[PDB]
Design a protein around this ligand. Structure first.
Ligand SMILES: N[C@@H](Cc1c[nH]c2ccccc12)C(=O)O
Ligand SMILES: [Mg+2]
Ligand SMILES: [Mg+2]
Ligand SMILES: [Mg+2]
Ligand SMILES: [Mg+2]
Ligand SMILES: [Mg+2]
Ligand SMILES: [Mg+2]
Ligand SMILES: [Mg+2]
Ligand SMILES: [Mg+2]
Ligand SMILES: [Mg+2]
Ligand SMILES: [Mg+2]
Ligand SMILES: [Mg+2]
Ligand SMILES: [Mg+2]
Ligand SMILES: [Mg+2]
Ligand SMILES: [Mg+2]
Ligand SMILES: [Mg+2]
Ligand SMILES: [Mg+2]
Ligand SMILES: [Mg+2]
Ligand SMILES: [Mg+2]
Ligand SMILES: [Mg+2]
Ligand SMILES: [Mg+2]
Ligand SMILES: [Mg+2]
Ligand SMILES: [Mg+2]
Ligand SMILES: [Mg+2]
Ligand SMILES: [Mg+2]
Ligand SMILES: [Mg+2]
Ligand SMILES: [Mg+2]
Ligand SMILES: [Mg+2]
Ligand SMILES: [Mg+2]
Ligand SMILES: [Mg+2]
Ligand SMILES: [Mg+2]
Ligand SMILES: [Mg+2]
Ligand SMILES: [Mg+2]
Ligand SMILES: [Mg+2]
Ligand SMILES: [Mg+2]
Ligand SMILES: [Mg+2]
Ligand SMILES: [Mg+2]
Lengths: 16, 102, 77, 63, 93, 46
RNA sequence: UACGGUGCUGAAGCAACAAAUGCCCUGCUUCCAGGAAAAGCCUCUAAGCAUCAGGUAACAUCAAAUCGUACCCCAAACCG
RNA sequence: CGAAGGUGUGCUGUGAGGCAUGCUGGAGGUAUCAGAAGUGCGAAUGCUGACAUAAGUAACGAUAAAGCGGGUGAAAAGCCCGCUCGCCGGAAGACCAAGGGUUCCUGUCCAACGUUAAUCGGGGCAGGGUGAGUCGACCCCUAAGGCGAGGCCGAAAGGCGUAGUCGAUGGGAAACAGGUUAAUAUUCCUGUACUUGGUGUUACUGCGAAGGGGGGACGGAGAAGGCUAUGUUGGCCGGGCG
RNA sequence: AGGACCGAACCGACUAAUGUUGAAAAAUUAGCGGAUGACUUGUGGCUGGGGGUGAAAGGCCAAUCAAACCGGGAGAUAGCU
RNA sequence: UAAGGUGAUAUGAACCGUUAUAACCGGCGAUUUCCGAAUGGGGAAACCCAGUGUGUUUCGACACACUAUCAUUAACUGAAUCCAUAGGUUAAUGAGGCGAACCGGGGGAACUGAAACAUCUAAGUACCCCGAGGAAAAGAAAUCAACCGAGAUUCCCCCAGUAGCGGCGAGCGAACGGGGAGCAGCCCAGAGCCUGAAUCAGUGUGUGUGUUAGUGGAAGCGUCUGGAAAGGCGCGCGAUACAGGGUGACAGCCCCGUACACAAAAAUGCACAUGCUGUGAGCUCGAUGAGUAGGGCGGGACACGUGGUAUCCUGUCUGAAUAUGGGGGGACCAUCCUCCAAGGCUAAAUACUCCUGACUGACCGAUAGUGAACCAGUACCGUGAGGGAAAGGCGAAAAGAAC
């Protein structure tokens, strides 16, 4: 499946 | 029917006994035959006290093919092919080449 | 089922068409009614689920004929 | 063993019938299972014999 | 009678096996593999007729086949019935 | 935690068993396909 | 005792006090939100049977089939 | 008297290649000129398999905890026995239902499974083991709900529903204390019981429904009294004189 | 008497640290809320995919949800990589 | 048919057979648990429980047989209601479920194409459903033609990507006529006489011919290399047989076959020939398919999108003429010509292959070829529908390694 950090929004969204 | 059959005396045509005569011991539905004193293989068999067997190497005869033997004519003294004729409602085998019923 | 016991009329599918000719499936289904019919020839009423026309046939051919049919054909009734 | 009893009488046969079971078959199982019966082929026939028994009798009466 | 003589092929084998069998010999009763459809009463009869002994009462239980061996696929044994028969008194065999 | 499979044979048979399968035109087509496929367990029953 | 166990024998076996969330209690008191069904059981007769058959009791006797019964079960035996 | 394939070597062509031959291999291969295409791979986070790497690194799953002696054994921190020590004790003890389905017991083996060793195991192999009128299912009875002769409805498939018929999570007859197996036991054994039908005997009698009525038959909270389990002490009994 | 009070079982999931190739695809430890009620629980039943259910978050409908899963149309179409 | 057999992994045990009751092959029988349309009721498929009949020199309880539903027919019964119906019991028949495609019928998508999207397309496709046959359907002009003529239906090649249709876009797309395959025509709408006379099906027999086991079937030796000859070399021989497989390396002559010639106790497909059942033939004189044709409204079919749109079908409301009559000839009218609707049947040329037999391939050769060369729809995954693998080769011979 996918690692938790990839699914998680705060770490992943990082630069909008 | 079958050309080479059970209690027959035959002469080998091919390979390692080529030319060795012998009597057919039995004939196996693989299309093979076991013939006495023709093919000898030294099997290694463990000695058994219960069966009172000495053990060590023993000599026996392996199954050769039916097509590797042909039955010995003994009137010509050579190998000979077999046919089937009818005599008095009996399907008998006969030697080819002198046409003699076996 | 919505089948006319006299004519065998049953619902048939066709289309709607708008002024822009948009096709939308639809059904035309028959003008059924179910009606107490006097036979006299059996001193009894029989309710046939019948179409108008089914009636107009019964008017013309006359009941008993129509009842020969149905029975000829096996219709319960 | 077939026509040997094609002609052996419907009533008479039901006798050997039992005699196959009544004796051979039951005694054989017991004796066998208990490690006696050295000649197993007796189990093959007997069973096959009863089959013959019942083939006639069925074909003699009614069929 | 009640059970045809034919159908007294319900007795299938003695279960002379384990002290369970023999230590429950030495204190009445004998035990046996017996049919599958056999009806306690039906198997008492067999033991009366054949074996010609007396029988107080018979208990039954079903043994379930052990499943075993094999690599991918698997093999199972047959189920079968146990006897435990309990003879009245002048006890013999 | 409590997971999704909570086994129970009564429910199993009632929901997926032979007879249940048999009680509906489509349930029957279920079997038909499995037979044509040559399946060894039509419906996981006793 | 083959050191895991296994046999044999065998005393007293009363009283006082305390005491449940168990039982009496499907009770009792009270309240509103007003608290399954059907059979077994008891009784009533209809058609029907009236010496019969049935019904009740005592004693005697016979029947009670079949299928489950190992083991884990807050877990190393189940869902993970 | 050694085909294809594999592995070297020499030569040759501008190249894709070709020829020769040693070794391996052990049975097929095909010039030439034509003919036909599953005709050429390094990449597509391509597909399948095999094998690297990080690396003999992290880790070996509750910080309830181990020490020693003696057995067995090729080998004992881990198995067996013993003496200490420590941990749970409304459980980390005990009986089940559900679910599993031989994991139970006994011999035997240790390759693989066990996050180590393993003589040990819920692991391999073989044999054994589940005993019922009374426990439970089946069974009678129904709830929810399901199915549903006819029937009403629906283009077909089908939908709903009456009579019914199914469906327990609830109602319905009856066995207890003790013993015994390596392994079951309210089932086996000893003692002592009970339930409902059939049949018979003997008395005495209106019996009789898929029907009527009764009963079964029912909520929440609260309050004590009476009582048992159960405990404590004394007495009693056996043993002790540290 | 009570959607009454303090507080175990039981039901919850406010804070923190740990864990994040976990012991664990959502738990551990210490604290925390409810705990005779709109409580909590075993068994069994009914509701089906533009449909269900929803003390309402687009929540949940088998680790899947702004339209479940399986098979099919099917080699959808891809002016893009 | 037979000298050897008791299926395979698979030895072993105990057997069976050799001149005909070993085995093996074929025809026809017999037995044929339980579940499953499941059919006595129930049910969590392979289980629980019955009513009624039978059954016991040990006539209890168990075992067996039968009892579903619907249809048709008959019989007997029989309400409100007396008649009569509905209702109810029994009985005889038939149905039911499964199955690859081809076939007819009831329903019927969207992706997509139009470089967007509604009309249009994809397409009457996919899919669901019902039904049937060996084929299905269609079919004996109310058809075309164009003043000359043709003469049922079906299929093939043309006509032609033409004429046309068409947001006249994308696309869709005939017919006339011609060449071919195969050709076949009959009943009802009815009574009289004569009567079972043609014919069709169902069926028994016969015969022939195919089928389901079978039989015979030619001719090679020497030597060299080698573990082994079928290979090389030599010399013979058969060929209506040089198809193919096997055998220790490549065999016309070792084996099994092949060409060729033969064979059926039994059961069957197909033809004829008849028997039995059911059925009608024949002549005279009649009859000639109305809620239909047409029309109005709404749709659908025709290549044809309503268009100037003939023609066909009908949900809806209507509604003729009847041989001096009526349909069609692509709006429509006249004339001409041509056909007879509103009842049916009908073989062949055409379609298809779950399966049987034989034969073939410039088809694959274990990541290929079926998912499956192998005990594969398996192991495994999933509540389920459902998904779904990997895995072939010792040798000529096990001689599979005693000690
Ligand atoms: N357990 C994770 C949290 C987590 C689990 N699944 C996730 C999916 C998406 C984001 C976060 C998570 C953690 O270490 O915090
Ligand atoms: Mg039992
Ligand atoms: Mg137990
Ligand atoms: Mg090659
Ligand atoms: Mg590559
Ligand atoms: Mg490149
Ligand atoms: Mg490192
Ligand atoms: Mg380090
Ligand atoms: Mg470490
Ligand atoms: Mg096991
Ligand atoms: Mg154990
Ligand atoms: Mg290890
Ligand atoms: Mg074990
Ligand atoms: Mg009930
Ligand atoms: Mg119905
Ligand atoms: Mg219903
Ligand atoms: Mg219950
Ligand atoms: Mg125990
Ligand atoms: Mg009495
Ligand atoms: Mg009452
Ligand atoms: Mg007390
Ligand atoms: Mg002192
Ligand atoms: Mg409170
Ligand atoms: Mg509190
Ligand atoms: Mg979820
Ligand atoms: Mg694509
Ligand atoms: Mg498409
Ligand atoms: Mg049944
Ligand atoms: Mg039934
Ligand atoms: Mg588009
Ligand atoms: Mg003319
Ligand atoms: Mg021959
Ligand atoms: Mg020959
Ligand atoms: Mg006419
Ligand atoms: Mg027709
Ligand atoms: Mg493959
Ligand atoms: Mg290879």
């Amino acid at each position: 499946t996918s690692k938790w950090f990839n699914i998680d929004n705060k770490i992943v969204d990082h630069r909008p | 029917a079958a050309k080479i059959r059970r209690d027959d005396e035959v002469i080998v045509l091919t390979g390692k006994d080529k030319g060795k005569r012998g009597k057919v011991k039995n004939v196996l539905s693989s299309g093979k035959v076991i013939v006495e004193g023709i093919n000898l293989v030294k099997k290694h068999q463990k000695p058994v006290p219960a069966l009172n067997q000495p053990g060590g190497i023993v000599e026996k005869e392996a199954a050769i093919q039916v097509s590797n033997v042909a039955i010995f004519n003994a009137a010509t003294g050579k190998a000979d092919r077999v046919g089937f004729r009818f005599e008095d409602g009996k399907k008998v085998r006969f030697f080819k080449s002198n046409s003699e019923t076996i | 089922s919505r089948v006319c016991q006299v004519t065998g009329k049953r619902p048939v599918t066709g289309n709607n068409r708008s002024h822009a000719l948009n096709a939308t499936k639809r059904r035309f289904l028959p003008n059924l009614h179910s009606h107490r019919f006097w036979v006299e020839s059996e001193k009894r009423f029989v309710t046939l689920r019948v179409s108008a026309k089914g009636m107009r046939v019964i008017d013309k051919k006359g009941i008993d004929t129509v009842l020969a049919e149905l029975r000829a054909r096996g219709e319960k009734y | 063993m077939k026509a040997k009893e094609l002609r052996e009488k419907s009533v008479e046969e039901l006798n050997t019938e039992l005699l196959n079971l009544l004796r051979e078959q039951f005694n054989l199982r017991m004796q066998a299972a208990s490690g006696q019966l050295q000649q197993s082929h007796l189990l093959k026939q007997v069973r096959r014999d009863v089959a013959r028994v019942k083939t006639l009798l069925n074909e003699k009466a009614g069929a | 009678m009640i059970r045809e003589e034919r159908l007294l092929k319900v007795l299938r084998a003695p279960h002379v096996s384990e002290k369970a069998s023999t230590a429950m010999e030495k204190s009445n009763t004998i035990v046996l593999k017996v049919a599958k459809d056999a009806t306690k009463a039906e198997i008492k009869a067999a033991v009366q007729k054949l074996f010609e002994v007396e029988v107080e009462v018979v208990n039954t239980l079903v043994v379930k086949g052990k499943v075993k061996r094999h690599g991918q696929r698997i093999g199972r044994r047959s189920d079968w019935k146990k006897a435990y028969v309990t003879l009245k008194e002048g006890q013999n065999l | 935690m409590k997971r999704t499979f909570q086994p129970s044979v009564l429910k199993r048979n009632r929901s997926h068993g032979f007879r249940a399968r048999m009680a509906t035109k489509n349930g029957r087509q279920v079997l038909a396909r499995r037979r044509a496929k040559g399946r060894a367990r039509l419906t996981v029953s006793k």
